[PDB]
Design a protein around this ligand. Structure first.
Ligand SMILES: CCCCCCCCCCCCO[C@@H]1O[C@H](CO)[C@@H](O[C@H]2O[C@H](CO)[C@@H](O)[C@H](O)[C@H]2O)[C@H](O)[C@H]1O
Ligand SMILES: CCCCCCCCCCCCO[C@@H]1O[C@H](CO)[C@@H](O[C@H]2O[C@H](CO)[C@@H](O)[C@H](O)[C@H]2O)[C@H](O)[C@H]1O
Ligand SMILES: [Zn+2]
Ligand SMILES: [Zn+2]
Ligand SMILES: [Zn+2]
Ligand SMILES: [Zn+2]
Lengths: 565, 565
């Protein structure tokens, strides 16, 4: 959008700190007004020395010095509260937006891009909102006052200095366009540097195993070189732009001098001398304005990237139905789905009904769409064709927070936080549960045995993503996390992929006790864990080719019979 | 260590940019010397107006303006070059260290801390290395010259101004200590904020499924509030620190004034007046020095944080043996291992020999230590008790780069990069392989069928960590990546956990053709894929309880018989 629209929207975040901003200006006025007083009283003491009591002058120095210090403290301290408060408000707004963005947003964006926006882009708007305003108001008023002051003595001579106003306006406009474009390139380049570093840290084991240290070094060297080159190009533009405006001023002054010499007749000192002296006070304010033009555009480009994320569309939440507890009946009716931005159809026509106290088993080859179907019930991705009804109400009529409270999920990709074992099991809505409840859930997931052997028991830290645990132990913590949540609907997405047969039997036996009070949807590749399911759905290329029980599907010679053995 | 040592070590990175620093100083000297010339020529032109040709003054104005612009451009551009070069060198040094740090370093540190160190801590050293030096040199020389001038005029009066030096020194020392501590706290807080943001971004699905948006919001709010409070505390400390030094200076000046009045006898103007005038030039340099101490200490803290990582111990690389190709014989002899910082024993006594063209199967319950045993061959973790020999040479005698070239690894946790399928399959040492080789490798891993159906074929982007693919497809891509590398030794760590029976059969059939020319170590929980292994090792609680073939282990009634059915 327009650069003025972005800047005015940025100033809306400085409104709560208007009172603190005025104190900073008042404090700096006290500091500035002291300098003439100290110098003036210094001269009086000196003059008295050469020549009705001056013995009070030494005492007055301390008072004015203390008065100067109070003004300096107010200016510096209360200006930081405006700058730090503005940055803090933007960071909180950016992070709270991350918790409502759709899943498809995180799939098409790197983590380094998002981290850099909250860390680096926010600091780029500090100067444009605090220091830039003071300079523009102060030096801007000085230039306007001087031009009115010059017009008073001689309007004919001011026409020469007015003729260079258009050329400065064109030059300032052209330079501002470059600064905004160059700042946008710099923030993207900084995001690329963070993206390379984040990717290498996440996959250091792949880099360490298959070689590629030379490949990773070159990739980061190019990313860092571009960031340095683009930052250096901005400085070169700024370092030529400021001196070039000064040369325009002095060229105009040179033309003014020639006219005065030719116009020296019919006049004398006191009128032409005053005009030349006044005209010489213009270069200094213009230099200050030039050096702040880069800062303003740097903030404008930074705020544009910040406001792009804040204006991004969140997941649809137009529902209003809230229920304390649902029966758990799940029904899918003629559902078809394709991922956004993709023309491939993942699900063609799905129809099944799950009654309370039942298991529905989802089996098939890899890539059939079993995880996609289970990811539409919690409304991770929006569906357009078909209906998904939970307890007779379409899942789009529930509120998002209320809908996800009734569904317990065990994803295929197990993710854990860098915290204690007890904190990982009781996370979010179930946080603060009694330790007895946590241990009961862990016992059901066959996880109490290895937890008790940890150095600190349930308080042991698992490290980053649970790296300090084996693959099967991480997965059993994810199962325990979902069992504590209870919920009428439980979806298991390959919950025993990293477990042996003995651990599977213990978990499968413990899952029969939660059979009666909930509806379970199981996606499994080991068919021995779903042999007691009420309904088994065999899905191939997005269509449920076969359905029935274990005996019915075995008698029929189809995909299930071949997959079973 | 000492702050002086850290600061001197930091200046070692500014040595390559000494010439640019001198050019910047020369340019700024050219800029500074112009102002008196312009003022004097303006005064000369004004005086001639009131009253042997002055018509060249306008041209001299333009010439001097151009000279001033050239000086300003040189100074600004080359100072920016020095700062950007220093930052780039520090970032490149930091990133290259990440590629040699041990696995245990990444296991005990968050990615957010490492990302923040390369991004935020590096920018904290610019001022202390570029702007601090000029101010310190200039104002220190000014203060020393002023003190010598005062001592020349009257040494008796200078004793009063000498008596305030110790209090200033003590005050500056205390302020510097506080500044260093506060800078360390601030950078730690920024690392915490980055860690919270990265953790929330990485595990957004868990946050979205189990609730906890309020929990994450509160955690990030606390982190940001702590960071803001610490920065505000530093600002308050500095803003109280400077005016207090000014007040000390002015108290000393008041005492001097009181002494002068009593000493007015036996003297007159020209000696006492000069002393008072000279003594009044001291507050400004001391004020300039005070405002730069905070920058120096902030840079010192940042440099200390950087040098802590740069001095971290890398993985041991004392070996020297290099081989172009090894036979592939693997032998483990009386190996025992415990993870660093942990008193629990993972492996007790392991002994097995793998001949070329053989399969060794590792089976057992979860947490037995199979991945730990498989992770010692590539020397991911250092072992102390026992010997691991590859082709009759202990694995610690090989160079790390040469040793890992002979081993192809399929880790349990599949990790992919945000790039094309072909780039993921051919990564690192095998980069640049012909497309025919990549397609042949993908065909063996039963991955060509689903790759050919992608929108762009082999050039399709898989997204962050391959999120745009199902788990089985990612695992098959990892298998293809490992198969392309060839290598005499191949280790598979649950390579078929996320695959159905048909894909498992296809991959197992394709793996029999690579049987003859390599030695294969397989860690499997699905025992149907290792029924044709030459040797099967059943490991329980870190000990190989049973060994033999499928028929031998089935005839014996032990752990394998129970695990099989
Ligand atoms: C609504 C906002 C705009 C409306 C009002 C704008 C008018 C601004 C009036 C400010 C006039 C005083 O100008 C002010 O002078 C002091 C020094 O003299 C400067 O202060 C500067 O030098 C001092 C010297 O110690 C430093 O402590 C300080 O860190 C530095 O910023 C301020 O940067 C400047 O802003
Ligand atoms: C080995 C290093 C130390 C040995 C040499 C140290 C002596 C330093 C001599 C420098 C004397 C000139 O001092 C220099 O003046 C100019 C302005 O007058 C300042 O420059 C400052 O104001 C100008 C005004 O346009 C701005 O363009 C510039 O961005 C800003 O930094 C420099 O910050 C200062 O360093
Ligand atoms: Zn992005
Ligand atoms: Zn799946
Ligand atoms: Zn850390
Ligand atoms: Zn394992």
């Amino acid at each position: 959008p327009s650069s003025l629209k972005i800047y005015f929207r940025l100033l809306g975040y400085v409104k709560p700190y208007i009172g603190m901003f005025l104190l900073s200006i008042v404090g700096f006025l006290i500091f500035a007004s002291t300098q003439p007083m100290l110098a003036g009283i210094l001269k009086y003491f000196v003059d008295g020395l050469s020549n009705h009591l001056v013995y009070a002058v030494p005492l007055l120095i301390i008072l004015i010095a203390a008065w100067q210090g109070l003004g300096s403290f107010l200016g510096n301290f209360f200006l930081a509260k405006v700058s730090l408060g503005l940055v803090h408000d933007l960071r909180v707004a950016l992070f709270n937006k991350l918790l409502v963005l759709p899943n498809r947003y995180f799939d098409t964006h790197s983590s380094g891009h998002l981290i850099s926006r909250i860390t680096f882009n926010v600091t780029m708007v500090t100067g444009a909102a605090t220091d830039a305003i003071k300079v523009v108001i102060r030096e801007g008023l000085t230039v306007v006052f001087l031009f009115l002051y010059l017009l008073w003595m001689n309007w004919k001579l001011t026409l020469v200095m007015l003729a260079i106003l258009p050329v400065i306006a064109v030059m300032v406009t052209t330079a501002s366009r470059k600064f905004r474009k160059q700042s946008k390139k710099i923030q993207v380049a900084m995001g690329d540097v963070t993206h390379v570093a984040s990717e290498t840290i996440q996959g250091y084991r792949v880099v360490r195993s298959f070689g590629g240290e030379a490949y990773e070094e070159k990739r980061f060297l190019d990313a860092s070189q571009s960031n340095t080159d683009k930052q250096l190009r901005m400085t070169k533009t700024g370092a030529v732009y400021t001196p070039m405006l000064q040369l325009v001023i002095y060229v105009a002054m040179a033309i003014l001098m020639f006219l005065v010499l030719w116009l020296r007749g019919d006049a004398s000192a006191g009128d032409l001398v005053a005009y030349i002296t006044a005209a010489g006070l213009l270069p200094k304010p213009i230099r200050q304005l030039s050096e702040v033009s880069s800062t303003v555009q740097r903030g404008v480009a930074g705020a544009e990237s910040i406001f792009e994320q804040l204006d991004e569309a969140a997941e649809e939440d137009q529902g209003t139905v809230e229920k304390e507890r649902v029966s758990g009946r799940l029904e899918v009716r003629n559902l078809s789905f394709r991922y956004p931005g993709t023309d491939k159809q993942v699900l063609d026509d799905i129809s099944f009904i799950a009654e309370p106290g039942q298991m529905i088993a989802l089996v098939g080859r890899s890539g059939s769409g079993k995880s996609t179907l289970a990811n539409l019930v919690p409304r991770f991705y929006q569906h357009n064709d078909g209906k998904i009804l939970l307890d007779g109400v379409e899942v789009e009529d529930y509120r998002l927070r209320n809908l996800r409270r009734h569904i317990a999920l065990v994803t295929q990709q197990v993710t854990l936080f860098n915290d204690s074992v007890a904190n990982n099991i009781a996370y979010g809505d179930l946080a603060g549960a009694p330790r007895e409840e946590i241990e009961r859930a862990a016992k059901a997931a066959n996880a109490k045995e290895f937890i008790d052997n940890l150095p600190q028991g349930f308080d042991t830290e698992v490290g980053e993503n649970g790296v300090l645990l084996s693959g099967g132990q991480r997965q059993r913590l994810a199962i325990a996390r979902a069992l504590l949540k209870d919920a009428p609907l439980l979806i298991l997405d390959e919950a025993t992929s990293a477990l042996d047969t003995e651990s599977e039997r213990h978990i499968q036996a413990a899952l029969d006790e939660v059979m009666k009070g909930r509806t379970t949807l199981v996606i499994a590749h080991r068919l021995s864990t779903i042999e007691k399911a009420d309904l088994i759905l065999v899905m191939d290329q997005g269509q449920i080719v076969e359905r029935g029980s274990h005996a019915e599907l075995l008698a029929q010679n189809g995909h299930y019979a071949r997959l079973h053995a």
